[PDB]
Subunit: 115 residues, 2 copies
Amino acid sequence: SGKKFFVTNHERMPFSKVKALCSELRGTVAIPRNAEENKAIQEVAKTSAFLGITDEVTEGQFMYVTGGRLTYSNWKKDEPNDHGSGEDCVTIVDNGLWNDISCQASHTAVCEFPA
Amino acid sequence: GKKFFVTNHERMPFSKVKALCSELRGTVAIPRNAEENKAIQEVAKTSAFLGITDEVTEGQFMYVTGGRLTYSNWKKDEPNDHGSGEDCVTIVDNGLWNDISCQASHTAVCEF
Ligand SMILES: [Yb+3]
Ligand SMILES: [Yb+3]
Ligand SMILES: [Yb+3]
Ligand SMILES: [Yb+3]
């Protein structure tokens, strides 16, 4: 990526636990700021992983957990869709594409640190 | 939860692994039982350094955090201090352990 490194224990848990874990490590839930970082996160995680982005405050408007409106994005076709009762978290899935999903779902924890 | 962590860094010498885990406020991974041994094996995939060395007294392996070993999984005839010297340990084939040079590049795995 060139600016940060990513860490994982390959454990799957709900978003609030991933956030607590990264805080314990003094890092942040992984956030792809560009295509290279996105591929880097996809590669280290291997399976679906949560990203540090949500639209909990303003529905339809995703923001970084660290603040600011989302710029770079790699949504799957027809996503984000706030499916069913709602989906406010984001996961990186096949091909590194993104899908908004329930924050209560369990996915791979990935934390980022400046390189 | 899963206590062993890996990064997207490439393989590196033991000094760099130690630097990495300390920068992360952790320790180089130490398996203290067969279950933990299998867990490090699975998160690393490729050979990885363990937090065990015989740097202080040749032939006497110790945890980097201190203490004599309570669990070991040495490959038959290991540790053999091959050639100049092998003071570091890697978990390799089928989870077995081999002492190797600390200057060799292997996967970094940290524990917290
Ligand atoms: Yb939403
Ligand atoms: Yb969705
Ligand atoms: Yb040795
Ligand atoms: Yb050896």
